[PDB]
Structure 1
Amino acid sequence: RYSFSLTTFSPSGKLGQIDYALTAVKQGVTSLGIKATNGVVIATEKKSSSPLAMSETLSKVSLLTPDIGAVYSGMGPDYRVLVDKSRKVAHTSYKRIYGEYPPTKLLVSEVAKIMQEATQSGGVRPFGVSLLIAGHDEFNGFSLYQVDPSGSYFPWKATAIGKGSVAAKTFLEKRWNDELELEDAIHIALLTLKESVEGEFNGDTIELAIIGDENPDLLGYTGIPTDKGPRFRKLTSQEINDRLEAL
């Protein structure tokens, strides 16, 4: 009986709607994040269950702000709204209070806060997804965080989520080092993900992006050296191929 409100607790505690939401997450695609000391690499694989469907149309790697991207595992529809609501809160709360994009630590709290509301009301369901959010800021360095449909956030050095989580997680535990390059971290990433699938593994269907060091290329304006380009950069298929060939 305690399952089906959000209002009913079990005798043992906890709410079911949060528990069942976590079940949902784990059905979604295999996505993983590794924190490095000069980057963060965030990676997922993609499908469409029909080759007719194009694969750029989907985006499962989205820059949230120019310095902070995110992925998911879980239900597709829920991601797309929640990223819209997050960009929109990012401006309200912090791009009018700093006049630029918020630090990573801040924005984790704000997105986690929309989850908290989608549990608080009854007759409104949680969101179906768990995010990884990785970004970089000027005071806490490079960073990685997990934001659960619970409305709780957890800081992570490395984690994985989704269908291949349990296997990916033990591979990460062993293979991670405390000091890795951005470049080495990409190789641990492609490889980890290749556990989840083989023979249909190619750079076309694998989306893999980074938050590294500034790029002056995607800044789009030049002559003002007192602002930094996007820390986020999305890598293309052909570039992922260079790294997959090099393995």
Structure 2
Amino acid sequence: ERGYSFSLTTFSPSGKLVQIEYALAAVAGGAPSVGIKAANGVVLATEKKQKSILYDERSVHKVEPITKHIGLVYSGMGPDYRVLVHRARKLAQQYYLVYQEPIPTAQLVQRVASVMQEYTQSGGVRPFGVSLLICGWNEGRPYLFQSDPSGAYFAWKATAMGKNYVNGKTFLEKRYNEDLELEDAIHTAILTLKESFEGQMTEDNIEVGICNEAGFRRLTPTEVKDYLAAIA
């Protein structure tokens, strides 16, 4: 090729970066999600509705493991998610090849956010349109982080990304507390996902993964049908 090598992002006269603020609009128009850090675990939940009655549910997953104690969800556009997932898989093994020890969840977000930094500054590529929620129970205490397409990150107690996130932000503030159990945390994680769901919620409309200290675990639809079985 030619080797053009020029970035598509410069400063405004006001001082803002224009294309990064446009990419957050595609994040806010994605599928909704919610993540709650409990006293003994981290609960992730999402909204998985098909556009037809034809689409199989055992093909594409939303809750996705990274290591056996680290999972990762998203709210944004579909195909850009699988890039950084496969990037985070190869990145997490390189820590294990050097140190012979599974990566802590703080150290993983130090490097995944640097990958999302690199597509904002380099030449001719566009920034991501996917924000994340990264979880895990390493060294006793569990963790729950959130990374944006700008390249920064945070540390939440309970948050919600996707559509109608300003309604779920007030609802989690009025419902969460200092501590719960993990089994109580899933109950307030569907009730904040029932706020913005459609008229029917089944075992195949939602999809829930958890983080015990025993490791990472995503739930089969047998438990999720039994969990929404008249317990709200």
TM band (smaller chain): over 0.9
Q: 107-116 or 46-55: which moved more?
A: 46-55
Q: CA deviation at 1:136?
A: 1.4
What is the SS of the residue equivalent to 2:100? Answer: coil
Partner SS for 1:97: helix
Partner SS state of residue 196, structure 1: coil
Query: Displacement, 1:170?
Result: 0.8
SS at 1:200 equivalent = coil
Shift of 1:6: 4.2
**C-alpha separation in 2, matches of 1:236 and 1:109:** 31
Number of equivalences: 225
Give RMSD over aligned pairs: 1.3
The corresponding residue for 2:73 is 71
Secondary structure of the 1:64 match is strand
Match of 2:202? Answer: 202
Deviation digits for residues 197-246 of structure 1 (CA, Å, limit 9, x no counterpart): 142211222101101121xxxxxxxxxxxxxxxx1111111211222122
Q: Which residue of 2 aligns with 1:118?
A: 119
Hey, what does 2:96 align to over in structure 1? 95
Q: Given the alignment, which residue of 54, 57, 66 partners 1:55?
A: 57
TM-score (norm 2): 0.93
Q: SS of the counterpart of 1:134? A: strand
User: What one-letter code is carried by the residue in structure 1 that aligns with 2:225?
Assistant: N
Asked whether the equivalents of residues 9 and 18 of structure 2 are also in contact (C-alpha less than 8 Å), the reply is no
Write the deviation string for residues 104-129 of structure 1: whole angstroms up to 9, x where unpaired.
00001111111000101131111110
Equivalent residue number for residue 14 of structure 2: 12
2:23 counterpart of 1:24: no
The share of aligned pairs that are identical, in percent, is 61
Alignment of 1:131-146 (within 5 A): 131-138=132-139, 141-146=141-146
Residue number in structure 2 paired with 1:191: 191
Matched position secondary structure for 2:83: helix
Amino acid in structure 2 at the alignment position of 1:69: G
Q: Distance in 2 between matches of 1:60 and 1:190?
A: 16
The answer to which structure, 1 or 2, has the higher relative contact order (CA under 8 A, 6+ apart) is 2
Cα distance in 2 for partners of 1:42, 1:6 equals 35
Q: Deviation per CA, 1:28-84, whole angstroms, max 9, x where unpaired?
A: 101010111100101101123122110121111100111110100001000011100
Residues 133 and 145 of structure 1 are in contact (CA less than 8 Å); yes or no, is this contact kept in structure 2?
Answer: yes
1:226 matched to which residue of 2? none
TM-score normalised to structure 1 length: 0.88
Retained in 2: the 8 A contact 1:55–1:205? no
**Is contact 2:27–2:76 with CA below 8 Å preserved after alignment?**
yes
Q: Letter of the aligned partner of 1:96 in structure 2? A: L
Question: Contact conserved, 2:135 with 2:145, CA < 8 A, in 1?
Answer: yes
Contact 2:113 2:152 in 1 (8 A): yes
